[PDB]
Design an enzyme around this catalytic site. Structure first.
Site, PDB file in Angstrom:
ATOM      1  N   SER A  75       0.859  -1.256   0.107  1.00 26.00           N
ATOM      2  CA  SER A  75      -0.123  -0.111   0.100  1.00 26.00           C
ATOM      3  C   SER A  75       0.812   1.175   0.089  1.00 26.00           C
ATOM      4  CB  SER A  75      -0.732  -0.105   1.104  1.00 26.00           C
ATOM      5  OG  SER A  75      -0.250  -0.161   2.407  1.00 26.00           O
TER       6      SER A  75
ATOM      7  N   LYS B  68      -1.689  -5.972   2.399  1.00 29.33           N
ATOM      8  CA  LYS B  68      -1.667  -5.143   3.741  1.00 29.33           C
ATOM      9  C   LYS B  68      -1.104  -6.248   4.561  1.00 29.33           C
ATOM     10  CE  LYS B  68      -5.826  -4.201   4.151  1.00 29.33           C
ATOM     11  NZ  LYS B  68      -6.388  -3.641   5.386  1.00 29.33           N
TER      12      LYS B  68
ATOM     13  N   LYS C 273       6.264  -6.918   4.817  1.00 27.79           N
ATOM     14  CA  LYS C 273       4.766  -7.448   5.008  1.00 27.79           C
ATOM     15  C   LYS C 273       4.725  -8.641   4.528  1.00 27.79           C
ATOM     16  CE  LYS C 273       2.351  -2.863   4.527  1.00 27.79           C
ATOM     17  NZ  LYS C 273       1.360  -2.500   3.797  1.00 27.79           N
TER      18      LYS C 273
ATOM     19  N   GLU D 203      10.815 -16.462   0.253  1.00 30.72           N
ATOM     20  CA  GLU D 203      10.565 -17.388  -0.863  1.00 30.72           C
ATOM     21  C   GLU D 203      10.249 -16.453  -1.993  1.00 30.72           C
ATOM     22  OE1 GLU D 203       7.403 -19.764   0.987  1.00 30.72           O
ATOM     23  OE2 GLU D 203       8.590 -21.540   1.041  1.00 30.72           O
TER      24      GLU D 203
ATOM     25  N   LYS E 257      17.753 -12.598  -9.071  1.00 33.90           N
ATOM     26  CA  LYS E 257      16.593 -12.691  -9.662  1.00 33.90           C
ATOM     27  C   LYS E 257      16.065 -11.444 -10.526  1.00 33.90           C
ATOM     28  CE  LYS E 257      17.200 -16.877  -8.248  1.00 33.90           C
ATOM     29  NZ  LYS E 257      18.235 -16.628  -7.499  1.00 33.90           N
TER      30      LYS E 257
END
Length: 135
Positions: free
Chosen positions: A11, A40, A70, A76, A113
């Site tokens: 956000s 969120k 968050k 991962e 990556k």
């Protein structure tokens, strides 16, 4: 797929980055949406990603410090930023307002990556990379 591209994001980055990037993409002819994929605190990211890949040909991620702190499985991300589903593909992850220490702390394997970076690349350069693949 109804949409060309969905943009996963935090956000904190919605109004001051994702919105101008989406408008630039729309000017290039890309049918992009992002409003439903705001991450969120305590959200399941993969829930958002599954929804995005279900109705979009492509997806990308705005990798900020806020986003990666968050993301419950931030470690991962190196798998998720290239995830595909129903032939729809996560592509071209975007470094945006992030520090190298943040990558070392919360997702070290993500480092090689990602190539796009809003501190070195303009919004227009990033939009063209997405537009050239989609159109």
């Amino acid at each position: 797929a109804e949409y060309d591209l969905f943009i996963s994001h935090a956000s904190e980055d919605k109004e001051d980055f994702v919105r101008p990037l989406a408008e630039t993409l729309q000017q290039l002819g890309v049918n992009v949406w992002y409003d439903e994929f705001t991450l969120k605190v305590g959200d399941s990211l993969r829930q958002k990603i599954d929804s995005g890949l279900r109705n979009s040909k492509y997806g990308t991620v705005v990798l900020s410090t806020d986003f990666i702190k968050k993301d419950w499985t931030n470690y991962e991300l190196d798998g998720l930023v290239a995830r595909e589903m129903n032939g729809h593909k996560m592509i071209l992850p975007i470094w945006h307002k992030i520090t190298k220490n943040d990558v070392l702390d919360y997702s070290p394997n993500l480092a090689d990556k990602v190539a796009l970076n809003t501190s070195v690349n303009s919004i227009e350069e990033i939009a063209h990379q997405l537009a050239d693949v989609i159109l």
